[PDB]
Design a protein around this ligand. Sequence first.
Ligand SMILES: [Zn+2]
Length: 90
Amino acid sequence: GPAFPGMGSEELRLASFYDWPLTAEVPPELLAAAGFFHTGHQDKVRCFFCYGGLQSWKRGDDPWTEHAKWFPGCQFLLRSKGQEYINNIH
Ligand SMILES: [Zn+2]
């Protein structure tokens, strides 16, 4: 199951970005959709399912792409985006 089942709701994940410092650069909507919630006040996020943590976001980074790049074994990623998507990023 998920590492953090309490953050399984996309809407709850989205709410966590109320204090996101990079709104124009990396949209909260895309982050939440990609399984990520905001951890702290800076630019750190974690996936609710695999608990993979990402920081140092650059402008235009794509949350799904980053999810697949760094945590290709995540089952939420697989279920959401499929194996072909993951393979093509790798
Ligand atoms: Zn994940």
